[PDB]
Amino acid sequence: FVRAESIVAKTLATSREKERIKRVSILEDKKAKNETQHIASGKDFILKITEGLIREKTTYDGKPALLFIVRVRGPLAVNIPNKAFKILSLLRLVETNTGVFVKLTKNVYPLLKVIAPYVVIGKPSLSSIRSLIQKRGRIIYKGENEAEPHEIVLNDNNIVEEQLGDHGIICVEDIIHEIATMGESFSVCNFFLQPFKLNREVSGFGSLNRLRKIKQREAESRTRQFSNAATAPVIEVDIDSLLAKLN
Amino acid sequence: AIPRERVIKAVNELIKFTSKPDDEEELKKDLQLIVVNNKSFTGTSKSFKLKLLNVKHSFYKPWKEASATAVKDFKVLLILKDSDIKKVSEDDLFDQLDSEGIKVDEIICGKDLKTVYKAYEARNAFISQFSLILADDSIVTSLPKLMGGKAYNKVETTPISIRTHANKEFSLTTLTNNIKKVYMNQLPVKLPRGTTLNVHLGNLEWLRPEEFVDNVELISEQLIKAYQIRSIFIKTNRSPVLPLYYNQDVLDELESTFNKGLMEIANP
Amino acid sequence: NDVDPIELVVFLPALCKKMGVPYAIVKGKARLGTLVNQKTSAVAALTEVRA
Amino acid sequence: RKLTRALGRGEVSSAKRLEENRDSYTLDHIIKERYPSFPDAIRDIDDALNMLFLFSNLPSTNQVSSKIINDAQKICNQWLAYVAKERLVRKVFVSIKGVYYQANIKGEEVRWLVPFKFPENIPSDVDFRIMLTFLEFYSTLLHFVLYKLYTDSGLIYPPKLDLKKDKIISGLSSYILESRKYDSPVASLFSAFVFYVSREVPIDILEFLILSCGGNVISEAAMDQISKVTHQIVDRPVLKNKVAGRTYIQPQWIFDCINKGELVPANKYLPGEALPPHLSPW
Amino acid sequence: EYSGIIYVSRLPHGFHEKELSKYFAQFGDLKEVRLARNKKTGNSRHYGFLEFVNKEDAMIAQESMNNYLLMGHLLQVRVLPKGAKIEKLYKYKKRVLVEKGITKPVKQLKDNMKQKHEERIKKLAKSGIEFKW
RNA sequence: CCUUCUCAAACAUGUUUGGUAGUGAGUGAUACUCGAGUUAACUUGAAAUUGCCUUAAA
């Protein structure tokens, strides 16, 4: 059975999400046209939130950066609109507890503005990147004697050499270097790697685990905020601590 | 802009029109300016922000001084940020506006609108008792959902955006200066999507005809440069209009980054 | 509704009706106890509420 | 049971206070009962080392938690830092399963196994509860042993870690060991030698071996996050232009030199030549 | 007597045609669901009608949702009497405006506004208003 | 049974500019520009009978 209160709440939340996406899309179209008399702001803001929490709002310098994006559960009673779902599917983030690497540019920024309330965005350190790749590294490999490929752990440097040797990628250390420095064949290595399947910070429904869930929800509500302002900065959090908890 | 003797005669005749011998005895004495424009003031997009026009003579101070003999007295509402509501009090405005006699009767934030005045009846009862509403320009963009649509059907209940922050921090000095400037020099006017603009000049009992003439001449001189206006009239409730201006030559105007981002984030 | 002995509250609806006070019979003295930080509660009342 | 009652009644603050006001069991008395002799503890810590180095390389799952994995990683790093600083490693053998180390600790030989940094798959056929019980016991035992060894060497335990160093590379270099001639030839091996380790070479293995048989290490992989170099440790089929003053060797030279004790000539180890067999020291 | 038509009132903002159909399809098959909306703006008038294949199902829906409290609204559900079909309930959308054609020439419109000005002069003369021009 | 655009840049604490599309129903008079766009103000419990992603899981 389905209750009318849940139906109405989902309708209202979906309507608000659609309105937010509409306003963001209009602002981005006017910014792209760049000849518009009427606009709110004409640049990009990054809000770094660290730890009783401190927030620093900075202008986006525009130089291409490296981000790690983790798909978290979205706002309550929201059915994901078509544009946000399309961007998430193109980023290969259709399910939660999944992370990918992203090359941050001026063209990438409006996509993050669209998909802000479903992801957490951070700057991965080298130790976190090495931990992610050497702990959870998987590829889709088609053997010579296998018709259909299956997903296996990134255990062979020979497979890396035979798949990305034309670009000049020999080993997993080379893949790490390419991802870290964002050089050539960065996209090739990034999509050679599968999206990373993390594990939940709190699992279980005993009394201790429910208390941990309550604390986690309180902390996430305190940290992450839903601006719904169509000019909001992109929130950047401590992805090192997040990956320590999730890996 | 407007001939001085012409506007003086029009004002004298219209103020004579009231004194020939409920709300019938009180509403028929409010002076209105009509501006007829060739095109829409705003354009194809609706606007809720009130334009501010500066005049030589004070307007709200005569309103406060003449509200002493009215059923609904003159009141001021102040809406500030939820994070800056704690940094001020009634004394923090009294000690700076006691010289000018400007009294802020109520200070609220968005939390009060969201919790205490959430209900429609309570919100209407709270809003309708204020004559001048001022709000911080940061929170003024969320007010169409908080104060509701009934509050925007009148110029007196429509909020006025004021600059409260100096150097990106809450400056009580800038807040007080903007409050004083709004209360003394400037008046609001709602720009509609049509071609007729109605300006509430005030009440005949508030000010003398000389002050009315000076204020309306300054308003006309300021609004001539703003747009390509077409006609100007002066009227009162239950009375016809009187022309004051006419121009002709202004009439002759009557006759993918998103996909690039998707490509950059996609592999093929 | 589950008060034993029932005489403790069997007169309450009539008293509320005679005094013109809105009342409601609810299931669970344990539920009312969670309301008032007790194990059980035979009755709860709202007198003053916020604006 | 009481926490469940508080949560069911909806007293979140009371539940938080109950969770704060709890005491957990410790295994220190059991450790002291089962190992009255520190030589007995040293003779038994080999299985503890194997289990901890296995669990420090596992990914986090529903059964195994990030806290447990991080604690195992910390204690393994502390053990490696102690061994490298006191210069006590004696034998190394790189087998297809992993790297076997033998080190002389307190007059006793300890042999343990370190797996490679690759995502091993969980079989979902083992008793993780039993293994985690063993892991808790082993963690307590090795905490006791590490405390005693650091104190007997005159060092502060637990050693502090450098946060930016751990952000660069999270290994034994993170923990700096503070206070308050070694035995030739293995400890004195690679003295006054600076090795530029290439990217494909295993940095943790090479750095641990060189630091235990003291030398300087310059990691190419450390330059991603952002002179004295005598040797460069590389493993590639074709190599680019080479520094004239720098000797270019393969990683097996280090292992063979450690296993021999004497300094094996570096001529027999070149990036474009065959390699001599890597014999087991045992 | 009673038909299979249900009148619903005091609806919240999120309750619309599709929401009502989705909710009451659990009670029974719906012949037609309509919601009163404003003609110029696409905003509901907070009441609507539904038709059930079974009048007994309509009666069950009424006795189930007669005084349901929903987001501060005490919903009201009535069974319409025998007959009394529902009619003329259009699903209006948010109307937009656009400038139409202006076929009168500049000279004709200037003459029209000058004649309006002369008419205003005549009206001021008629109403005993002593003003110039 | 969800919860509302809480601001930007230019110049020297100040001046200019952009940024705000609403619960519904009803009463009403009065003027302006082409069935359209505008125009004093009054009522009301949130009022109402028909304008053709799944560990917020069982």
GROMACS .gro file of N, CA and C in nm, chain D residues 25-119:
model
  285
  591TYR      N    1   3.632  -0.479   2.761
  591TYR     CA    2   3.729  -0.576   2.813
  591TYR      C    3   3.867  -0.553   2.752
  592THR      N    4   3.969  -0.598   2.825
  592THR     CA    5   4.107  -0.595   2.780
  592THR      C    6   4.168  -0.733   2.797
  593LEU      N    7   4.270  -0.761   2.717
  593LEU     CA    8   4.334  -0.892   2.714
  593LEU      C    9   4.475  -0.891   2.772
  594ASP      N   10   4.513  -0.783   2.842
  594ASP     CA   11   4.650  -0.770   2.890
  594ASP      C   12   4.683  -0.874   2.997
  595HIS      N   13   4.589  -0.902   3.087
  595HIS     CA   14   4.613  -1.003   3.189
  595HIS      C   15   4.627  -1.141   3.126
  596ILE      N   16   4.549  -1.169   3.021
  596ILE     CA   17   4.562  -1.295   2.949
  596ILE      C   18   4.698  -1.304   2.880
  597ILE      N   19   4.745  -1.193   2.822
  597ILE     CA   20   4.876  -1.192   2.758
  597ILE      C   21   4.986  -1.221   2.860
  598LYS      N   22   4.981  -1.153   2.975
  598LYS     CA   23   5.082  -1.173   3.078
  598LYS      C   24   5.075  -1.313   3.138
  599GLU      N   25   4.956  -1.373   3.143
  599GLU     CA   26   4.943  -1.509   3.193
  599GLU      C   27   4.999  -1.610   3.095
  600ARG      N   28   4.966  -1.595   2.966
  600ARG     CA   29   5.007  -1.694   2.866
  600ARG      C   30   5.153  -1.681   2.826
  601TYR      N   31   5.214  -1.563   2.839
  601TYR     CA   32   5.355  -1.543   2.805
  601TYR      C   33   5.425  -1.479   2.924
  602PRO      N   34   5.460  -1.558   3.025
  602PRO     CA   35   5.538  -1.502   3.137
  602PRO      C   36   5.677  -1.458   3.096
  603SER      N   37   5.729  -1.507   2.984
  603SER     CA   38   5.863  -1.475   2.939
  603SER      C   39   5.856  -1.397   2.808
  604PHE      N   40   5.924  -1.283   2.806
  604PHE     CA   41   5.943  -1.211   2.681
  604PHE      C   42   6.012  -1.294   2.572
  605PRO      N   43   6.110  -1.380   2.601
  605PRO     CA   44   6.155  -1.474   2.496
  605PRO      C   45   6.045  -1.563   2.441
  606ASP      N   46   5.951  -1.608   2.525
  606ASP     CA   47   5.838  -1.686   2.475
  606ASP      C   48   5.750  -1.601   2.384
  607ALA      N   49   5.726  -1.476   2.423
  607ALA     CA   50   5.648  -1.386   2.337
  607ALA      C   51   5.716  -1.364   2.203
  608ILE      N   52   5.848  -1.345   2.204
  608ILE     CA   53   5.923  -1.326   2.080
  608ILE      C   54   5.920  -1.452   1.995
  609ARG      N   55   5.930  -1.569   2.059
  609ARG     CA   56   5.919  -1.695   1.986
  609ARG      C   57   5.781  -1.716   1.927
  610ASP      N   58   5.677  -1.652   1.982
  610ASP     CA   59   5.542  -1.675   1.933
  610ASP      C   60   5.487  -1.564   1.843
  611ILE      N   61   5.554  -1.449   1.831
  611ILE     CA   62   5.495  -1.338   1.756
  611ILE      C   63   5.497  -1.354   1.605
  612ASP      N   64   5.551  -1.465   1.554
  612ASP     CA   65   5.560  -1.480   1.408
  612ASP      C   66   5.422  -1.497   1.345
  613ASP      N   67   5.336  -1.578   1.407
  613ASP     CA   68   5.199  -1.593   1.358
  613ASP      C   69   5.122  -1.463   1.370
  614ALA      N   70   5.147  -1.388   1.478
  614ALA     CA   71   5.085  -1.257   1.495
  614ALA      C   72   5.125  -1.162   1.383
  615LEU      N   73   5.254  -1.161   1.348
  615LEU     CA   74   5.301  -1.077   1.239
  615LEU      C   75   5.237  -1.117   1.106
  616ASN      N   76   5.229  -1.247   1.079
  616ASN     CA   77   5.168  -1.293   0.955
  616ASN      C   78   5.021  -1.252   0.946
  617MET      N   79   4.946  -1.272   1.055
  617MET     CA   80   4.804  -1.236   1.055
  617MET      C   81   4.785  -1.086   1.040
  618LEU      N   82   4.866  -1.005   1.110
  618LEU     CA   83   4.850  -0.860   1.102
  618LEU      C   84   4.888  -0.806   0.965
  619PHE      N   85   4.995  -0.858   0.905
  619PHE     CA   86   5.032  -0.812   0.771
  619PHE      C   87   4.933  -0.860   0.666
  620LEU      N   88   4.866  -0.973   0.691
  620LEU     CA   89   4.758  -1.014   0.602
  620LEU      C   90   4.638  -0.920   0.614
  621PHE      N   91   4.596  -0.890   0.737
  621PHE     CA   92   4.477  -0.808   0.756
  621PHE      C   93   4.499  -0.662   0.722
  622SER      N   94   4.624  -0.614   0.726
  622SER     CA   95   4.650  -0.475   0.690
  622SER      C   96   4.639  -0.450   0.540
  623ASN      N   97   4.631  -0.554   0.458
  623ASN     CA   98   4.618  -0.540   0.314
  623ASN      C   99   4.477  -0.569   0.263
  624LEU      N  100   4.385  -0.609   0.351
  624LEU     CA  101   4.249  -0.637   0.310
  624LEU      C  102   4.170  -0.508   0.291
  625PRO      N  103   4.076  -0.506   0.197
  625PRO     CA  104   3.981  -0.394   0.189
  625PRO      C  105   3.872  -0.407   0.294
  626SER      N  106   3.804  -0.295   0.318
  626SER     CA  107   3.696  -0.292   0.415
  626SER      C  108   3.570  -0.356   0.359
  627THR      N  109   3.504  -0.437   0.441
  627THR     CA  110   3.379  -0.502   0.403
  627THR      C  111   3.278  -0.490   0.516
  628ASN      N  112   3.167  -0.563   0.506
  628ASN     CA  113   3.068  -0.561   0.613
  628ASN      C  114   3.119  -0.633   0.738
  629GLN      N  115   3.200  -0.737   0.720
  629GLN     CA  116   3.253  -0.813   0.833
  629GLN      C  117   3.380  -0.751   0.891
  630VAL      N  118   3.466  -0.694   0.808
  630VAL     CA  119   3.593  -0.637   0.850
  630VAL      C  120   3.586  -0.485   0.836
  631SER      N  121   3.616  -0.414   0.944
  631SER     CA  122   3.594  -0.271   0.952
  631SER      C  123   3.721  -0.191   0.922
  632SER      N  124   3.700  -0.068   0.877
  632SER     CA  125   3.810   0.023   0.847
  632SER      C  126   3.894   0.052   0.971
  633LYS      N  127   3.831   0.058   1.088
  633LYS     CA  128   3.905   0.081   1.212
  633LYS      C  129   4.003  -0.033   1.239
  634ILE      N  130   3.957  -0.157   1.224
  634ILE     CA  131   4.043  -0.273   1.246
  634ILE      C  132   4.156  -0.276   1.144
  635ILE      N  133   4.124  -0.249   1.017
  635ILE     CA  134   4.226  -0.250   0.912
  635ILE      C  135   4.330  -0.141   0.937
  636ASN      N  136   4.285  -0.022   0.977
  636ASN     CA  137   4.376   0.089   1.004
  636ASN      C  138   4.465   0.061   1.125
  637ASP      N  139   4.409  -0.001   1.229
  637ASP     CA  140   4.490  -0.037   1.345
  637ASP      C  141   4.596  -0.140   1.309
  638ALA      N  142   4.559  -0.239   1.228
  638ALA     CA  143   4.657  -0.337   1.182
  638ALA      C  144   4.766  -0.271   1.098
  639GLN      N  145   4.728  -0.177   1.011
  639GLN     CA  146   4.826  -0.105   0.931
  639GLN      C  147   4.921  -0.024   1.019
  640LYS      N  148   4.867   0.041   1.122
  640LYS     CA  149   4.949   0.120   1.213
  640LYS      C  150   5.051   0.033   1.286
  641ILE      N  151   5.006  -0.081   1.340
  641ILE     CA  152   5.097  -0.165   1.417
  641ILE      C  153   5.201  -0.229   1.326
  642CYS      N  154   5.163  -0.264   1.202
  642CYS     CA  155   5.261  -0.315   1.107
  642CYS      C  156   5.365  -0.209   1.072
  643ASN      N  157   5.321  -0.084   1.053
  643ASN     CA  158   5.415   0.024   1.024
  643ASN      C  159   5.510   0.047   1.140
  644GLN      N  160   5.460   0.039   1.263
  644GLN     CA  161   5.547   0.056   1.380
  644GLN      C  162   5.651  -0.056   1.388
  645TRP      N  163   5.610  -0.180   1.363
  645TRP     CA  164   5.706  -0.291   1.362
  645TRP      C  165   5.811  -0.273   1.253
  646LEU      N  166   5.768  -0.235   1.133
  646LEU     CA  167   5.863  -0.214   1.023
  646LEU      C  168   5.959  -0.099   1.054
  647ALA      N  169   5.909   0.009   1.113
  647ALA     CA  170   5.994   0.122   1.148
  647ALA      C  171   6.098   0.082   1.252
  648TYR      N  172   6.057   0.005   1.354
  648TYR     CA  173   6.152  -0.041   1.454
  648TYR      C  174   6.261  -0.128   1.391
  649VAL      N  175   6.220  -0.224   1.306
  649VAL     CA  176   6.318  -0.313   1.245
  649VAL      C  177   6.414  -0.236   1.156
  650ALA      N  178   6.361  -0.142   1.076
  650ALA     CA  179   6.445  -0.065   0.985
  650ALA      C  180   6.542   0.026   1.061
  651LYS      N  181   6.497   0.086   1.171
  651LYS     CA  182   6.585   0.177   1.244
  651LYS      C  183   6.691   0.101   1.323
  652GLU      N  184   6.654  -0.013   1.383
  652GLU     CA  185   6.752  -0.090   1.458
  652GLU      C  186   6.840  -0.177   1.369
  653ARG      N  187   6.808  -0.187   1.239
  653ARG     CA  188   6.892  -0.253   1.139
  653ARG      C  189   6.915  -0.400   1.176
  654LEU      N  190   6.804  -0.475   1.175
  654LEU     CA  191   6.802  -0.611   1.225
  654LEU      C  192   6.760  -0.716   1.122
  655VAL      N  193   6.734  -0.678   0.997
  655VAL     CA  194   6.691  -0.776   0.898
  655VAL      C  195   6.812  -0.857   0.852
  656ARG      N  196   6.789  -0.984   0.825
  656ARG     CA  197   6.899  -1.072   0.788
  656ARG      C  198   6.876  -1.145   0.656
  657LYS      N  199   6.754  -1.190   0.629
  657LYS     CA  200   6.725  -1.266   0.508
  657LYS      C  201   6.599  -1.211   0.441
  658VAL      N  202   6.599  -1.211   0.308
  658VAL     CA  203   6.483  -1.168   0.230
  658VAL      C  204   6.468  -1.263   0.111
  659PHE      N  205   6.344  -1.300   0.081
  659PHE     CA  206   6.315  -1.392  -0.029
  659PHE      C  207   6.184  -1.352  -0.094
  660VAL      N  208   6.190  -1.314  -0.222
  660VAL     CA  209   6.072  -1.269  -0.294
  660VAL      C  210   6.015  -1.389  -0.370
  661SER      N  211   5.915  -1.454  -0.311
  661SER     CA  212   5.845  -1.563  -0.376
  661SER      C  213   5.717  -1.511  -0.440
  662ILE      N  214   5.657  -1.595  -0.525
  662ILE     CA  215   5.539  -1.554  -0.602
  662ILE      C  216   5.422  -1.521  -0.510
  663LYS      N  217   5.419  -1.579  -0.390
  663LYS     CA  218   5.314  -1.544  -0.295
  663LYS      C  219   5.340  -1.410  -0.227
  664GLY      N  220   5.466  -1.374  -0.204
  664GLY     CA  221   5.496  -1.251  -0.132
  664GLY      C  222   5.642  -1.249  -0.091
  665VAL      N  223   5.675  -1.152  -0.006
  665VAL     CA  224   5.813  -1.131   0.037
  665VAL      C  225   5.829  -1.186   0.179
  666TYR      N  226   5.918  -1.282   0.195
  666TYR     CA  227   5.950  -1.339   0.325
  666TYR      C  228   6.071  -1.268   0.383
  667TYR      N  229   6.058  -1.221   0.507
  667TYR     CA  230   6.165  -1.156   0.580
  667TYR      C  231   6.204  -1.240   0.701
  668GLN      N  232   6.334  -1.246   0.729
  668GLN     CA  233   6.387  -1.305   0.851
  668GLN      C  234   6.475  -1.201   0.918
  669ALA      N  235   6.443  -1.168   1.043
  669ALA     CA  236   6.515  -1.068   1.120
  669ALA      C  237   6.550  -1.123   1.257
  670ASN      N  238   6.665  -1.079   1.309
  670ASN     CA  239   6.715  -1.128   1.438
  670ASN      C  240   6.668  -1.032   1.547
  671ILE      N  241   6.566  -1.074   1.622
  671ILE     CA  242   6.506  -0.992   1.727
  671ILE      C  243   6.540  -1.055   1.861
  672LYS      N  244   6.619  -0.982   1.942
  672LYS     CA  245   6.653  -1.021   2.079
  672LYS      C  246   6.719  -1.159   2.085
  673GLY      N  247   6.805  -1.188   1.988
  673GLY     CA  248   6.871  -1.316   1.983
  673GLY      C  249   6.789  -1.430   1.928
  674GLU      N  250   6.672  -1.401   1.870
  674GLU     CA  251   6.586  -1.503   1.812
  674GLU      C  252   6.550  -1.463   1.670
  675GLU      N  253   6.538  -1.562   1.582
  675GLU     CA  254   6.509  -1.538   1.442
  675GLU      C  255   6.358  -1.539   1.418
  676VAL      N  256   6.307  -1.433   1.358
  676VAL     CA  257   6.165  -1.417   1.331
  676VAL      C  258   6.147  -1.410   1.180
  677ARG      N  259   6.065  -1.500   1.126
  677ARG     CA  260   6.035  -1.505   0.984
  677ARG      C  261   5.888  -1.473   0.963
  678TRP      N  262   5.859  -1.377   0.876
  678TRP     CA  263   5.722  -1.338   0.847
  678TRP      C  264   5.708  -1.309   0.699
  679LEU      N  265   5.583  -1.293   0.655
  679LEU     CA  266   5.549  -1.278   0.514
  679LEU      C  267   5.469  -1.150   0.493
  680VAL      N  268   5.508  -1.072   0.394
  680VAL     CA  269   5.440  -0.949   0.355
  680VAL      C  270   5.381  -0.969   0.216
  681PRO      N  271   5.250  -0.955   0.199
  681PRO     CA  272   5.190  -0.964   0.066
  681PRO      C  273   5.216  -0.839  -0.017
  682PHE      N  274   5.200  -0.854  -0.148
  682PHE     CA  275   5.213  -0.741  -0.239
  682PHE      C  276   5.090  -0.651  -0.230
  683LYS      N  277   5.106  -0.529  -0.280
  683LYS     CA  278   5.000  -0.428  -0.274
  683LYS      C  279   4.904  -0.445  -0.392
  684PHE      N  280   4.826  -0.552  -0.385
  684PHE     CA  281   4.728  -0.583  -0.488
  684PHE      C  282   4.595  -0.622  -0.424
  685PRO      N  283   4.483  -0.597  -0.493
  685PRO     CA  284   4.352  -0.627  -0.435
  685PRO      C  285   4.318  -0.775  -0.430
   0.00000   0.00000   0.00000
